[PDB]
Amino acid sequence: RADEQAFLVALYKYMKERKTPIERIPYLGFKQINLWTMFQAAQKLGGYETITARRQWKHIYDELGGNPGSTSAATCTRRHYERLILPYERFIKGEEDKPLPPIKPRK
C-alpha cells in the first residue's frame, strides 16, 4: 500500500510536469481513482501484458468487486492505467523483476 502511494505521488509530480496530472484523471470507473488496487489486481490478472493479449479488464472488475451496473469500469480504466502506472511499472519490470542486474552477463 504505502510504497505504491509514495511512487504514485512521485508519478503525480512527474506527470504534472508532463501536462497530464491526476487532476485530469478523476475516476476508476464507478469510484475515485484507487491506483495501488487496480495495479495489484492487474498483476494478479497477468500484468498489463496478459490484459492486452486477452482484454482481461473484465476480470480486474472481478478483483475490484465493482458496482452492479458499471461494465464500462475496468474497460475505461485501461485508458487511465496506460498513463498512470504503465510508465512507472517500467522500474519494476526493468530494475527489480530481472534475474540479474544489467552490470553482469550472468547471475
UniProtKB/Swiss-Prot annotation:
Residues 1-93 form the ARID domain. Methylation at Lys-19 prevents DNA-binding. Demethylation by PHF2 promotes recruitment of the PHF2-ARID5B complex to promoters. The modification N6,N6-dimethyllysine is found at residue 19. It comes from the Eukaryota. It is found in: Nucleus. Coiled coil: none annotated. Widely expressed, including in liver (at protein level). Belongs to the ARID5B family. The ARID domain mediates the interaction with DNA. It is linked to Defects in ARID5B may be a cause of susceptibility to coronary atherosclerosis in the Japanese population. Leukemia, acute lymphoblastic: A subtype of acute leukemia, a cancer of the white blood cells. ALL is a malignant disease of bone marrow and the most common malignancy diagnosed in children. The malignant cells are lymphoid precursor cells (lymphoblasts) that are arrested in an early stage of development. The lymphoblasts replace the normal marrow elements, resulting in a marked decrease in the production of normal blood cells. Consequently, anemia, thrombocytopenia, and neutropenia occur to varying degrees. Transcription coactivator that binds to the 5'-AATA[CT]-3' core sequence and plays a key role in adipogenesis and liver development. Acts by forming a complex with phosphorylated PHF2, which mediates demethylation at Lys-19, leading to target the PHF2-ARID5B complex to target promoters, where PHF2 mediates demethylation of dimethylated 'Lys-9' of histone H3 (H3K9me2), followed by transcription activation of target genes. The PHF2-ARID5B complex acts as a coactivator of HNF4A in liver. This is AT-rich interactive domain-containing protein 5B. It comes from Homo sapiens. The chain holds residues 318 to 424 of 1188 of the full protein.
